[PDB]
Design a protein around this ligand. Structure first.
Ligand SMILES: CC(=O)N[C@@H]1[C@@H](O[C@@H]2O[C@@H](C)[C@@H](O)[C@@H](O)[C@@H]2O)[C@H](O[C@@H]2O[C@H](CO)[C@H](O)[C@H](O)[C@H]2O[C@@H]2O[C@@H](C)[C@@H](O)[C@@H](O)[C@@H]2O)[C@@H](CO)O[C@H]1O
Ligand SMILES: CC(=O)N[C@@H]1[C@@H](O[C@@H]2O[C@@H](C)[C@@H](O)[C@@H](O)[C@@H]2O)[C@H](O[C@@H]2O[C@H](CO)[C@H](O)[C@H](O)[C@H]2O[C@@H]2O[C@@H](C)[C@@H](O)[C@@H](O)[C@@H]2O)[C@@H](CO)O[C@H]1O
Lengths: 288, 288
């Protein structure tokens, strides 16, 4: 097993098309998350809707159709091949920012302004597992539309956006949803990789694996040889070890954050390096 | 360390010049055509060239601070992480788009209602990214620190077309050097993505390395042990070799296309695999 030899600020978020700005631990360190993107086992098994490339993250493709009140999209995979409602929660790469309006910028797969902004609510017609969503738009999109999540806003007036939530993929879900990630306790806290992103009335989107970690694991198909992988976070200029982290086989990273601090207090240009396989209860030196 | 290429099928690789997925390979209609792309450029030893960034989510992005001039508005460019851009030995900030001789339309948000601004950028006199600024017009009112992504392109003037095979005039701008087809019947392999090119001959953008190849080389920091690396393009299900390719130290890929054909006739679900180091003069079996 190796992990990407790339500084953290050159790594992409796995839940929005953005670069990682910093690490942090959650304010409540017992908080459970269930992100559907950025999910991959160390052996290279993709989970949820997680795609391989950073340029598949939080994108939507589909064909415009007429609904009772206006338009909708009959979803396809991002490469234009048919989506089928099967085991995945949604087409691969489908956004997983829950409980908010989405604003998705698409183009028809030209003359004049080729872009349409699809304004999508997560209400009853939001059925991505089934393969359809509805939208309103100030433009007039038709046919095969491909696009990217541009920004998010509250579902109802005066409310707030919580990007730590995931969507409900619909009533047909019974489905390979990626499972919740539980803090393993004993002082350990899940490490979240944060990105600037336009969240209106939120300002940063968390994910649990940088996207290049996901493609690294998929590519490598490495055997898991211990209960956790001990990583060092290294200053790439001085080559000094800045802190210890554990990478778990189910595909998330923890640290023991110093009280009143944590990995948010580390420089954001360090490189993760695999050090050794360790047992499940290997005790980390606190960080930050 | 031993050179490898990503164990990822073609259709899961990102374009290195626009934020998009690769959907096919091809050769240029003039097989003697020389290109000088500034993104997607990296040596096999992991040396980035031109404006090439590491992550697919840095590709064709722009960041800067809005300022007002005597006659309009401009962007004082920074690197994508907000740190200062200095004119030194690069054409522009890392990741800056390299689609030449056309208008750009760049969707940005304020790193801080509708949060988006579309910056409409002409490649005329005030387009001076090497020196650290460009001018724009916008129907919105962007201020302060704006970060965004190239959304679409259109012709510079009314009668014109967009040729995405061209690069900008950035100004001595320290360009990555031209790539020549290297002889022996070989043609440069171009990796194509759908993208909203308005008034292009097609709505596709070529690049010379998939973005994940770039990050792979940067990570691996592998020694070059021969004049060219022979690759096989392999079907991942049957494991059959679908064609020979050469990967050159300067960071590009060639094949010998069959007359009237080429890699555009190959399936798009194959995986490149390193075979061996070969002589510069190694004669490839024709493909497609
Ligand atoms: C002052 C007021 O009530 N203005 C509303 C808009 O609501 C304001 O801006 C929204 C983006 C939120 O920040 C909201 O908290 C704020 O009051 C309203 O925008 C819509 O707001 C709803 C939530 O109530 C959704 O977020 C919806 O997606 C928003 O519509 C988007 O943003 C709008 C500003 C427009 O750009 C739309 O085209 C977008 O789809 C608008 C529209 O209902 O009405 C104002 O009066
Ligand atoms: C029918 C007509 O003349 N319309 C023009 C617009 O030009 C049309 O749409 C363009 C995108 C091209 O497809 C063109 O071939 C087509 O006739 C014109 O758009 C501008 O076109 C110039 C080139 O002549 C530049 O490409 C410029 O960037 C375009 O402006 C952008 O696209 C516009 C549609 C608007 O969205 C602008 O805000 C963009 O900046 C417009 C603007 O001059 O005028 C119409 O009458």
């Amino acid at each position: 097993l190796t992990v990407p030899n790339i500084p953290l600020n050159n790594l992409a978020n796995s839940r929005v098309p953005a670069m990682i700005n910093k690490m942090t631990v959650s304010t409540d360190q017992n908080q459970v998350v269930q992100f559907q993107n950025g999910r991959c086992t160390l052996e290279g098994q993709l989970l949820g809707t997680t795609p391989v490339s950073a340029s598949q993250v939080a994108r939507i493709r589909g064909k415009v159709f007429s609904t009772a009140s206006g338009k909708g999209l009959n979803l396809t995979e991002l490469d234009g091949t048919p989506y089928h409602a099967f085991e995945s929660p949604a087409p691969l790469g489908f956004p997983d920012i829950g409980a908010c309006d989405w604003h998705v910028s698409t183009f028809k797969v030209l003359s004049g302004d080729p872009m349409s902004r699809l304004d999508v609510k997560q209400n009853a017609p939001f059925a991505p597992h089934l393969g359809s969503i509805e939208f309103t738009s100030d433009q007039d999109p038709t046919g095969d539309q491909l696009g990217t999540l541009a920004w998010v806003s509250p579902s109802t007036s005066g409310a707030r956006v919580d990007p730590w939530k995931i969507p409900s993929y619909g009533s047909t879900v019974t489905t390979h949803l990626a499972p919740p990630i539980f803090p393993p306790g004993f002082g350990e806290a899940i490490v979240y990789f944060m990105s600037d992103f336009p969240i209106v009335s939120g300002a940063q989107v968390p994910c649990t694996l940088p996207q290049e970690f996901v493609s690294h694991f998929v590519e490598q198909q490495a055997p898991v040889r211990g209960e956790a992988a001990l990583l060092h976070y290294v200053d790439p200029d001085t080559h000094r070890n800045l802190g210890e982290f554990k990478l778990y086989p189910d595909g998330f990273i923890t640290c023991v954050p110093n009280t009143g601090g944590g990995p948010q207090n580390l420089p954001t240009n360090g490189v993760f390096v695999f050090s050794s396989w360790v047992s499940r209860y290997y005790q980390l030196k606190p960080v930050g």
